[PDB]
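Q: How do we represent a protein-ligand complex in a form that can be generated token by token?
A: Start from the inputs.
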Amino acid sequence: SREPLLRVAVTGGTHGNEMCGVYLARYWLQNPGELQRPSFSAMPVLANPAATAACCRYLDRDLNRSCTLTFLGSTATPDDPYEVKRARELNQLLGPKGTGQAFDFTLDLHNTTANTGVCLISESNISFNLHLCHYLQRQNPGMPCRLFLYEPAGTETFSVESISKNGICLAMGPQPQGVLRADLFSRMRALVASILDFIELFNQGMDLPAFEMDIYRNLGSVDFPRTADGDLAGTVHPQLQDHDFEPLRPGEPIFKLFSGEDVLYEGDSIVYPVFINEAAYYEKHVAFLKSEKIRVTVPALLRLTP
Amino acid sequence: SREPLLRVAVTGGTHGNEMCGVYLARYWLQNPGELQRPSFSAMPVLANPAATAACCRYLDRDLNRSCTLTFLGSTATPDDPYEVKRARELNQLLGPKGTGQAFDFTLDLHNTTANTGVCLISESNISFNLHLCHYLQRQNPGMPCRLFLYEPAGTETFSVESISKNGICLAMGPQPQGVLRADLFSRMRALVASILDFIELFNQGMDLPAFEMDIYRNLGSVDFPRTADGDLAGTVHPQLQDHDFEPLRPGEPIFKLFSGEDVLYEGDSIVYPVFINEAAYYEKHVAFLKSEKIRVTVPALLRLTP
Ligand SMILES: CC(=O)N[C@@H](CS[C@@H](Cl)CCl)C(=O)O
Ligand SMILES: CC(=O)N[C@@H](CS[C@@H](Cl)CCl)C(=O)O
Ligand SMILES: [Cl-]
Ligand SMILES: [Cl-]
Ligand SMILES: [Cl-]
Ligand SMILES: [Cl-]
Ligand SMILES: [Zn+2]
Ligand SMILES: [Zn+2]
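Then emit the structure tokens for the protein with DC2 bound:
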């Protein structure tokens, strides 16, 4: 029988310069009304305080690559990276990751400089999460709302939502870092209201019929064309730029070198590039990500089994 | 009689995270060919080295607000801001500002997160500079190429181009910081080639007939709606966002508060907002800039007077 989700968090500011998250967090800390539902209330949290204030992605280490049980379970020192110190505080608050104490759910807000529009990033295929995406699609006709599935290859998970029993990132782009677009703030806000609505109904005992949907499963990344120096030698090609989620046949151009030469996609088959030309992924050696567009079957989530 | 411009510089990377400049600079340092013209060669320079590498705007102080004669003429200490140390090195190289030693001309490259497209920022109305903009307009039909006139209210000038006898910024947006768009890199590159072409002809003794053009003269800025805390209380309104250089009548909306309320433009007459929602201007308390669209007469620049 269905367990209601009662300890629910919404984290903004995991990256200090992704502004929808940041300003929603700050706002709700002052104005928690809109996070109240009948069966539960979602705790608003500003994930990376120091970064949010310096308005940069991270101080010492990406907070969202810092929540492995190794990191979390390690022994303090003087000069642990700030984000490691902070990760542990989030473990204290939302976890401990892996224990029965952890939150029921974390909704983690993000912005991107890629043209992804609305995208939910999920680290497993737990049906709850696909039912959720699907609820969002139904509530917003004609607005795309896509699911990026990024399972961990290893066993170690790294992200802030990985701390709670379940979780998911709401990613929205394009937006420059340090820039708050009114249209995106308000659309994030609405989608968050809707995600909370969803959880209300789930808790209320709502039947969620099995269904089918297309999703986007990570195949791994592609780095920028580089000089032996490890420097850029070109950038995302004009015909790829801004076309996240659209199909990339082999033989099509993906980069343009400074020397004027087109670079071409070499691969077995058609893929779906996602997070094309994200500011933050330059250092992570990632010009974009390769996904396969599959169609999965999502089991029903019922109050009672039949 | 006309003096040729012979010591000419192109600075990129004044802000470490504005990428067209940065990658053009790095490129030319390796590939100086395309900066050679018959009568002169332009020296490529990476303006802010430390910032360019940390990929941020500035380390201690905006390099482009750090070239006043006070700063330049001040006495070293241990803990002068890095950009002040660096400003002085640029004075050594391109100046000294105000002396007969200084460069003939500095072309200073910039990117913006506002939707300005191609914009030349000039700190005086020296006809050379308007003749230049005008040359750019003629060479690129249908592509807007606008002149933002930002005279110094005081006497003290602050920018990197202010060091050379004359100079001008080439600004192009929109682009997120830390993101290099291929279309913008290459269009900057072409426009730079063209600016050098211009100087070639000027040096060759070319007659530049008097003419008339519209320009955009600064009237000052408008800050974001703020909480008494000095925090944001809203952002650029959806109908203003992305509409740089287009007219703002009074009574039209300029902000949208988080509380849902439209803020309205209050002023004497129609203005032309420029650099709407630039990441970097959040701390400088500037949501956008007000300009008046005037039509000036530009004197001829002839080889011989008639
Ligand atoms: C560019 C950016 O800050 N977007 C987030 C997305 S969430 C993560 Cl669970 C998987 Cl990639 C990230 O890159 O960390
Ligand atoms: C946002 C940005 O980095 N653009 C430059 C423009 S040039 C300056 Cl001469 C007058 Cl505003 C600046 O703001 O410094
Ligand atoms: Cl993109
Ligand atoms: Cl559903
Ligand atoms: Cl804008
Ligand atoms: Cl002309
Ligand atoms: Zn993020
Ligand atoms: Zn700049």
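The two ends of chain B are 12 Å apart (CA to CA). The longest strand of chain B covers residues 211-222.
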